[PDB]
Amino acid sequence: ASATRVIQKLRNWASGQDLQAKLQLRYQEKKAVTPAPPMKRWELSKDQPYL
Amino acid sequence: VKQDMPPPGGYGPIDYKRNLPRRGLSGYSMFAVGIGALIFGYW
Amino acid sequence: TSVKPIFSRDLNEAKRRVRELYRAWYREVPNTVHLMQLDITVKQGRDKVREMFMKNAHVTDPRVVDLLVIKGKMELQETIKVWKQRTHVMRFFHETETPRPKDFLSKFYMGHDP
Amino acid sequence: TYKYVNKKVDMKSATDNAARILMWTELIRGLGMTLSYLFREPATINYPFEKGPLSPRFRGEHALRRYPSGEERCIACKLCEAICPAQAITIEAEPRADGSRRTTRYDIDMTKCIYCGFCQEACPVDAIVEGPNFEFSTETHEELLYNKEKLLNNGDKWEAEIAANIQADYLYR
Amino acid sequence: ITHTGQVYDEKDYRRVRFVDRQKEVNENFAIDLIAQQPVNEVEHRIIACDGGGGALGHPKVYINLDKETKTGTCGYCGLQFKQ
Amino acid sequence: LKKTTGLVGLAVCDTPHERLTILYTKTLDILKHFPKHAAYRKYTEQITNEKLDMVKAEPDVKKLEALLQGGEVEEVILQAEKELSLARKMLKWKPWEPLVEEPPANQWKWPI
Amino acid sequence: QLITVDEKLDITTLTGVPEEHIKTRKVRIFVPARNNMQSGVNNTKKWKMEFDTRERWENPLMGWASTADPLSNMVLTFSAKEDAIAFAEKNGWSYDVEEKKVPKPKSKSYGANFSWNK
Amino acid sequence: AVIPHGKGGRSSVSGVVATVFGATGFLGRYVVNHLGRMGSQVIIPYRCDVYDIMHLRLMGDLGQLTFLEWDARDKDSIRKAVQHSNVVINLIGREWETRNFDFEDVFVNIPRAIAQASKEAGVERFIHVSHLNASMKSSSKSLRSKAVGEKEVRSVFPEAIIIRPSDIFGREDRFLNHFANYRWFLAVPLVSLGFKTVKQPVYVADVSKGIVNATKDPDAVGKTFAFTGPNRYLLFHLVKYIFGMTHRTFIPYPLPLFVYSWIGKLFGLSPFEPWTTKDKVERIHISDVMPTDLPGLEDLGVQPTPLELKSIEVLRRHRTYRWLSSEIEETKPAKTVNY
Amino acid sequence: VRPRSDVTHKQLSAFGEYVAEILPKYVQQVQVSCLDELEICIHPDGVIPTLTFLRDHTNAQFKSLADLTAVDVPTRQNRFEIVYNLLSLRFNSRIRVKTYADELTPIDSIVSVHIAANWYEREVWDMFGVFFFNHPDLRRILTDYGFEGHPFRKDFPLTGYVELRYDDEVKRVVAEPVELAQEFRKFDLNSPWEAFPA
Amino acid sequence: NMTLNFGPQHPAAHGVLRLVLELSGEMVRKCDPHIGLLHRGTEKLIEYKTYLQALPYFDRLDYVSMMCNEQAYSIAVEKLLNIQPPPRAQWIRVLFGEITRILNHIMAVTTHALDIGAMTPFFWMFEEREKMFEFYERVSGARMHAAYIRPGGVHQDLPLGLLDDIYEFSKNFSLRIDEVEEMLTNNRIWRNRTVDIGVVTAEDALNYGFSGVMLRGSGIQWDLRKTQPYDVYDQVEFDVPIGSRGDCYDRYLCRVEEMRQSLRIIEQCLNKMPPGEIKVDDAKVSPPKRAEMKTSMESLIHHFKLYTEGYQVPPGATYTAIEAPKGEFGVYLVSDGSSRPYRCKIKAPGFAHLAGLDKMSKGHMLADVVAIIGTQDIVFGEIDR
Amino acid sequence: GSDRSRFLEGKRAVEDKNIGPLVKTIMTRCIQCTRCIRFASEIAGVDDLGTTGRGNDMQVGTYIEKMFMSELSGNVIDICPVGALTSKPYAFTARPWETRKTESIDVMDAVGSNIVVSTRTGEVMRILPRMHEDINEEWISDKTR
Ligand SMILES: NC(=O)C1=CN([C@@H]2O[C@H](COP(=O)(O)OP(=O)(O)OC[C@H]3O[C@@H](n4cnc5c(N)ncnc54)[C@H](OP(=O)(O)O)[C@@H]3O)[C@@H](O)[C@H]2O)C=CC1
Ligand code: SF4
Ligand code: SF4
Ligand code: SF4
Ligand SMILES: [Zn+2]
Known part of the structure; x- marks a missing residue:
């Protein structure tokens, strides 16, 4: 930390997000039988189907 | 005897998603400032 | 008895392959002594190939002979290419190790278990 | 549940693309990130003056402890030798005149040792412990081989901290 | 010198090692330290010996201080107990 | 119709129902030479017949993909001709014949 | 088609063993006896063949035992006497098999010792 | 003593505790090698910096080699080195008598004190080393001095094996490298045009094994073995041969030894290890003594090894980009002149 | 107690018969272990045929080769027990096909069936000495270039017979017969008392 | 066809790899990787050691992924004994299983860049790594090579306070992954050296046994953690990051995405880890607590026998595979009734991947080979074993 | 138990x-x-x-x-x-796991009782009986142990 409020703003502007919130300084016939039922195809993730 | 366990009520939430910000000057605006600079320089 | 064959039905055919490998090594010894800058004499080297070839001269089992050349050929490849750097080749000559006498009196004088 | 990492011509779209391609924008973005850290406090520690934190279970360097009275704890059961994965510990024993059972020779070969910490685990009297010190680099290979006298001496030097460390972690074990 | 008196000798071919470098030996040898320990008097016929501190001691054993003739000695601490 | 299959190398096969019907009917044909009571012939004929019965029955590829599983239809095509290749291979191999030889005695006894 | 060989499988030439340790090493095929200390007999079941013991000189620097014989710690376990003999023949090591000796049946009965007569 | 147990290789014991004072140098590198290979306890006194002594550490098992700080002008240092050794080998020698050590010191003065103490200690045998053909009236102060010493060493440690070796050639040899190193001088100045200079060269290893064997052999006591070689040579063939393997031209140029002793003086003047010296020059142009009767390498068990056999390894570094790939048997071996 | 799902034990058993009927010729034994795993055992000649059927059969697609290994039971006449473990991404299942090979009776190579085996087969030759016919390039992979002997064989000494050190005289690394400074202490660990099989 | 040994000591080549190459021009005609420069005998040594004293070998097999490897042997030994770990231990193993995945991906993505030439991502994330190591140390005692996950559960409960810190870190690590993306994910130059380099088809990836991100990157959906759940990876919810147009860039994106998904799994584990014991209660398999062995005779006997002799696993053989960060890590552990194993072939995701180097780097430049060794996360310990 | x-x-x-x-x-x-x-x-x-x-x-x-x-x-x-x-x-x-056990013959007395010599790191540590039905059936003399 010890950003001084101006190095921090250059840091925030250059990065484009707030590092202050997430700092680098930690502080205090028969059936053919398959081996098992065919796997169901996976579902699209609902929270983010694509990145 | 105490066992390290999640705090009561559970921990808070973490971010698991990219928060990369799509911030930029629009392209036309970008080119115009540049072309304007060359026009002034040429004059 | 009653054993399946690998590459040679009879010692005869197998011996054919040994001849080929010998030739291979014989033709190769000189090159190695030059591409590895080994400090040995080609004549000496070919002698080594002979010795190593002869060391297993007793075998009369078709199958055993066939594997022996497979293995022999593999060694050649490595040596043909530079996969086996000099340290590897010279090891064949057992240059650093001190030779042990086989005379009984000699062993008696030196080792508890001969 | 699966996710597609990289599944995916208006003038504006095309122009902006050209703006990026010819103005190298995505490259300038990267420079900003590094300039940002240049302003962050670096995380390095003065190594001799400040030391990277190690908690009580750190295995570090072997030591043989002694009872407060002054009787060395080891009673030569020799299962520390049995469970040593690397064959490092060599123990030979004989009844001391007292009649008690003690190790005539206890040699941990530290170069053979892979600091697993099972010996710490196995000892019934907990005579052999993984001491905190990690700085025992030695000029000669022989110094690394340790006999009973070096380990007992190592035990006496670090006993105060070893006792504190075992005090902190014994409930867990 | 040492506990079991290791004495690489004046004629050994190993005493060469300490030349210009000291040997590792121990003061406060343990052999004499428990001998320096007072005999723990007790009332009961048999007594325990956690080694002192329970989990931080030795597997607990019960010693029979039944004969004043002999002060029981826990095989782990070498502590003599005087009935 | 689709743009592409998930699998990188596989490419969309247009006329997929026709391509499958061609491959499925071929296999059935090759199997016709296998010995009559040969286990492979009875088992695979049953699997292949069910597959194309479904292929002929379903005119929608997306539902076709659900009915015989197979994920994308293109894969089912690859599996069918792979099987067609093995059917040709096994006729040469003649696996239906009796066991080559019994294992040596105690060859399969693990406790040792 | 198979070919015929009456040559005892000897594969000493393929195993890759130094000449000294194939011609000077005698291995003994024996069923391990039981440490009289314990009465369990689960370690007297499988045959083992063990190579002859060799030099174990003291090490000058630390006093640890030191051995120059590679085949010392190797004891292979074979289920039957016939199979173990086969291993020695094809590997070319000399063998001297020792017959298993199993405890003879012994007649015991609690009533018998209560006999004052005898 | 130390009963010899083991199979014969590293990590085995032979029972020879041996101080070897000049281990740091050319031959020492070899003496410690065999002694270490055999499993002998080797105490190497050193006054060179620890960085230089490192090459020695790699040779021998954990605890076989012990290094002690020692100063020649201090008798006490020699005293403690031989305290626990039973074999003392002396290889102390130099070619340029230095500011604070003159030939007497390096050859006669020091090597005496050493054996002297060794006796006080009770070492079984002492093996002093003096040059072959070190006549007490030879031309080089060195050879004269070396002889002077052998006389003295016999007084202090009577019957301390003495070995007088002939020119010694091995990687890092002077005899073989030095000539190859005359390349800078376009032509090669050789008295009598390199003739009238018969010399017999001995591989460094040959000399060593002998020395080591001398320690473990009873007959060696009170002997003056002279390791010589497998073939003699007029200096002419030697010089050319060398240049031959080095594949560098040869221009043997006659130059009076008179004037040349002066060239040696010039290099001798140089502060840093003169490349050549008045004495070295004389020694060079000093012919080797006859076989006489002195026993030899094969007597001590090591059959001499011909120069041509290993020359290729010693002279290889001096070749060029391509010449570096030529081998000795396609090359022509030079003729042998016994004279 | 592990959470066994009998649902599996049965389905895999049923496949085991399926395969046994489909290839009566090479399958010698088939069993679904209590650990819910199938281990068809095939005559060495059935290496090519049994694998291919599993790689390319609609009702049993076993596309990837998890591993090829060779336990060595010295007692067993056929010393090596080549074991091939295969996976089916389609049916989410696995099967192990294990054959037996003696030292000088080579097995066929499956590099054709699965190219994954190109390396593992070289690994089995280097460590155990089994030979694989029709292998594209069989040559030692893990051992040193000049190594003599097959290391994972139960009859090979752990420490081995050769070790390397640098020798000044010859200025080059040099093998010497192994001389160890503390031999491997061979603790005997088997207890003379067995455990009554459940 | 110029021949050249990439060289054992190559700043780029991870560890020591002699990649003999025949290069037509700068293009690489043939790639014959050599292996065994790190063979050490791990498979033979284990036969001479008891089950618990062979656990430390597994940490060394692929030590970037120190613990995840230990879980595979654990699971395998537990199956043979038909014992399963207690509920808290399972969550722990998934907690440290994932932390370990991050550690591997930070290694793989940042070391990939160092060979490419980007050096600042490595320093950025090695600081985060460092912080993670400290978790290992405060749980096991060792920064890496812990030996914490043993065959019957973990060794000792988490210190009183670790969970809270594995939170603070997790709460922030995301931003640290975010920062790297900025520089590389879209660098106008990362893409070029990575995109369309080493494309592997889907059918070919299954055929050469790739089994890892390498398969997932080609679009094949297979995560052994979802298909065949091990431990309690079933009770968590995560999304496998499947890829299309599989190439060095796509797979990378996948590894950055599993770093993201592992933070989702870690969060849960912290939110839902049960109160309980961390080792099986069968003194038969798990060593007795030290208070118990020092006060109860049956516990000393069980402590003495377990440490000196061993588990005595029932005779059998099993192949158990987990989803180690590199790919499918499996142990085929044949076992006689003895306390020491009989065979333990370690399947290394990496023996298969290297083999693919030839079929991936064809008609490629010297720099391409450097990029592809990176996209396979080759740790020579697992390949050489 | x-x-x-x-x-x-x-x-x-x-x-x-x-x-x-x-x-x-x-x-x-x-x-x-x-x-x-x-x-x-x-x-x-x-x-x-x-x-x-x-x-x-x-x-x-x-x-x-x-x-x-x-x-x-x-x-x-x-x-x-x-x-x-x-x-x-x-x-x-x-401690017994370490002891390497070599089966040999009693020479102290002429019954030739079978015995097992337990050696550790090359010095004999104990001699205990091994069973021979006919000669020493699990017992050895005080002298020969
Ligand atoms: N090859 C040859 O030229 C021949 C040599 N010899 C004899 O063999 C012996 C060994 O030869 P070589 O190894 O080539 O000789 P080097 O010039 O290599 O020196 C041999 C050793 O003597 C030591 N030494 C030299 N001067 C002093 C000094 N003033 N005080 C203490 N130590 C000293 C050196 O140690 P440091 O350098 O650290 O002082 C070195 O270790 C010599 O003594 C020589 O007389 C005999 C015939 C031929
Ligand atoms: S375990 Fe503890 S007590 Fe038993 S020997 Fe090793 S150290 Fe001495
Ligand atoms: S730490 Fe592991 S290896 Fe080192 S001694 Fe204790 S047990 Fe043996
Ligand atoms: S009674 Fe049983 S236990 Fe007690 S001493 Fe006699 S034998 Fe040993
Ligand atoms: Zn006590």
Whole structure:
């Protein structure tokens, strides 16, 4: 930390997000039988189907 | 005897998603400032 | 008895392959002594190939002979290419190790278990 | 549940693309990130003056402890030798005149040792412990081989901290 | 010198090692330290010996201080107990 | 119709129902030479017949993909001709014949 | 088609063993006896063949035992006497098999010792 | 003593505790090698910096080699080195008598004190080393001095094996490298045009094994073995041969030894290890003594090894980009002149 | 107690018969272990045929080769027990096909069936000495270039017979017969008392 | 066809790899990787050691992924004994299983860049790594090579306070992954050296046994953690990051995405880890607590026998595979009734991947080979074993 | 046996006595199995060792302290499965897993009793009997061990 409020703003502007919130300084016939039922195809993730 | 366990009520939430910000000057605006600079320089 | 064959039905055919490998090594010894800058004499080297070839001269089992050349050929490849750097080749000559006498009196004088 | 990492011509779209391609924008973005850290406090520690934190279970360097009275704890059961994965510990024993059972020779070969910490685990009297010190680099290979006298001496030097460390972690074990 | 008196000798071919470098030996040898320990008097016929501190001691054993003739000695601490 | 299959190398096969019907009917044909009571012939004929019965029955590829599983239809095509290749291979191999030889005695006894 | 060989499988030439340790090493095929200390007999079941013991000189620097014989710690376990003999023949090591000796049946009965007569 | 147990290789014991004072140098590198290979306890006194002594550490098992700080002008240092050794080998020698050590010191003065103490200690045998053909009236102060010493060493440690070796050639040899190193001088100045200079060269290893064997052999006591070689040579063939393997031209140029002793003086003047010296020059142009009767390498068990056999390894570094790939048997071996 | 799902034990058993009927010729034994795993055992000649059927059969697609290994039971006449473990991404299942090979009776190579085996087969030759016919390039992979002997064989000494050190005289690394400074202490660990099989 | 040994000591080549190459021009005609420069005998040594004293070998097999490897042997030994770990231990193993995945991906993505030439991502994330190591140390005692996950559960409960810190870190690590993306994910130059380099088809990836991100990157959906759940990876919810147009860039994106998904799994584990014991209660398999062995005779006997002799696993053989960060890590552990194993072939995701180097780097430049060794996360310990 | 103990009560202790210079009787170890009292009466005719008392303080030691002096004496060590009485010379020199066991022949006496020589790191640590039905059936003399 010890950003001084101006190095921090250059840091925030250059990065484009707030590092202050997430700092680098930690502080205090028969059936053919398959081996098992065919796997169901996976579902699209609902929270983010694509990145 | 105490066992390290999640705090009561559970921990808070973490971010698991990219928060990369799509911030930029629009392209036309970008080119115009540049072309304007060359026009002034040429004059 | 009653054993399946690998590459040679009879010692005869197998011996054919040994001849080929010998030739291979014989033709190769000189090159190695030059591409590895080994400090040995080609004549000496070919002698080594002979010795190593002869060391297993007793075998009369078709199958055993066939594997022996497979293995022999593999060694050649490595040596043909530079996969086996000099340290590897010279090891064949057992240059650093001190030779042990086989005379009984000699062993008696030196080792508890001969 | 699966996710597609990289599944995916208006003038504006095309122009902006050209703006990026010819103005190298995505490259300038990267420079900003590094300039940002240049302003962050670096995380390095003065190594001799400040030391990277190690908690009580750190295995570090072997030591043989002694009872407060002054009787060395080891009673030569020799299962520390049995469970040593690397064959490092060599123990030979004989009844001391007292009649008690003690190790005539206890040699941990530290170069053979892979600091697993099972010996710490196995000892019934907990005579052999993984001491905190990690700085025992030695000029000669022989110094690394340790006999009973070096380990007992190592035990006496670090006993105060070893006792504190075992005090902190014994409930867990 | 040492506990079991290791004495690489004046004629050994190993005493060469300490030349210009000291040997590792121990003061406060343990052999004499428990001998320096007072005999723990007790009332009961048999007594325990956690080694002192329970989990931080030795597997607990019960010693029979039944004969004043002999002060029981826990095989782990070498502590003599005087009935 | 689709743009592409998930699998990188596989490419969309247009006329997929026709391509499958061609491959499925071929296999059935090759199997016709296998010995009559040969286990492979009875088992695979049953699997292949069910597959194309479904292929002929379903005119929608997306539902076709659900009915015989197979994920994308293109894969089912690859599996069918792979099987067609093995059917040709096994006729040469003649696996239906009796066991080559019994294992040596105690060859399969693990406790040792 | 198979070919015929009456040559005892000897594969000493393929195993890759130094000449000294194939011609000077005698291995003994024996069923391990039981440490009289314990009465369990689960370690007297499988045959083992063990190579002859060799030099174990003291090490000058630390006093640890030191051995120059590679085949010392190797004891292979074979289920039957016939199979173990086969291993020695094809590997070319000399063998001297020792017959298993199993405890003879012994007649015991609690009533018998209560006999004052005898 | 130390009963010899083991199979014969590293990590085995032979029972020879041996101080070897000049281990740091050319031959020492070899003496410690065999002694270490055999499993002998080797105490190497050193006054060179620890960085230089490192090459020695790699040779021998954990605890076989012990290094002690020692100063020649201090008798006490020699005293403690031989305290626990039973074999003392002396290889102390130099070619340029230095500011604070003159030939007497390096050859006669020091090597005496050493054996002297060794006796006080009770070492079984002492093996002093003096040059072959070190006549007490030879031309080089060195050879004269070396002889002077052998006389003295016999007084202090009577019957301390003495070995007088002939020119010694091995990687890092002077005899073989030095000539190859005359390349800078376009032509090669050789008295009598390199003739009238018969010399017999001995591989460094040959000399060593002998020395080591001398320690473990009873007959060696009170002997003056002279390791010589497998073939003699007029200096002419030697010089050319060398240049031959080095594949560098040869221009043997006659130059009076008179004037040349002066060239040696010039290099001798140089502060840093003169490349050549008045004495070295004389020694060079000093012919080797006859076989006489002195026993030899094969007597001590090591059959001499011909120069041509290993020359290729010693002279290889001096070749060029391509010449570096030529081998000795396609090359022509030079003729042998016994004279 | 592990959470066994009998649902599996049965389905895999049923496949085991399926395969046994489909290839009566090479399958010698088939069993679904209590650990819910199938281990068809095939005559060495059935290496090519049994694998291919599993790689390319609609009702049993076993596309990837998890591993090829060779336990060595010295007692067993056929010393090596080549074991091939295969996976089916389609049916989410696995099967192990294990054959037996003696030292000088080579097995066929499956590099054709699965190219994954190109390396593992070289690994089995280097460590155990089994030979694989029709292998594209069989040559030692893990051992040193000049190594003599097959290391994972139960009859090979752990420490081995050769070790390397640098020798000044010859200025080059040099093998010497192994001389160890503390031999491997061979603790005997088997207890003379067995455990009554459940 | 110029021949050249990439060289054992190559700043780029991870560890020591002699990649003999025949290069037509700068293009690489043939790639014959050599292996065994790190063979050490791990498979033979284990036969001479008891089950618990062979656990430390597994940490060394692929030590970037120190613990995840230990879980595979654990699971395998537990199956043979038909014992399963207690509920808290399972969550722990998934907690440290994932932390370990991050550690591997930070290694793989940042070391990939160092060979490419980007050096600042490595320093950025090695600081985060460092912080993670400290978790290992405060749980096991060792920064890496812990030996914490043993065959019957973990060794000792988490210190009183670790969970809270594995939170603070997790709460922030995301931003640290975010920062790297900025520089590389879209660098106008990362893409070029990575995109369309080493494309592997889907059918070919299954055929050469790739089994890892390498398969997932080609679009094949297979995560052994979802298909065949091990431990309690079933009770968590995560999304496998499947890829299309599989190439060095796509797979990378996948590894950055599993770093993201592992933070989702870690969060849960912290939110839902049960109160309980961390080792099986069968003194038969798990060593007795030290208070118990020092006060109860049956516990000393069980402590003495377990440490000196061993588990005595029932005779059998099993192949158990987990989803180690590199790919499918499996142990085929044949076992006689003895306390020491009989065979333990370690399947290394990496023996298969290297083999693919030839079929991936064809008609490629010297720099391409450097990029592809990176996209396979080759740790020579697992390949050489 | 069982995985854990339920004996929350206290333990007993007996008083170590002297049975001689060869057998160390740390008899607080004794499981009152009466093998010794048998061997000492049936295999060897000493008839000295006996049970003394009843209840949980039955101690199987000589009532008066008379040493167990007889040949065949050391066998008690091998026959007591508990380590109550064990060998005094081989008190604490080793531990059995380490001991490499080589099967050889007794040369001290002409019965040629079979014996197993237990060697650790190259010096013999103990010689204990190995069974030969005809010659020494599980027993060896006090001299040859
Ligand atoms: N090859 C040859 O030229 C021949 C040599 N010899 C004899 O063999 C012996 C060994 O030869 P080589 O190894 O080539 O000789 P080097 O010039 O290599 O020196 C040999 C050793 O003597 C030591 N030494 C030299 N001067 C002093 C000094 N003033 N005080 C203490 N130590 C000293 C050196 O140690 P440091 O350098 O650290 O002082 C070195 O270790 C010599 O003594 C020589 O007389 C005999 C015939 C031929
Ligand atoms: S375990 Fe503890 S007590 Fe038993 S020997 Fe090793 S150190 Fe001494
Ligand atoms: S730490 Fe592991 S290796 Fe080192 S001694 Fe204790 S047990 Fe043996
Ligand atoms: S044998 Fe051992 S245990 Fe049985 S009674 Fe005699 S002493 Fe007590
Ligand atoms: Zn006590």
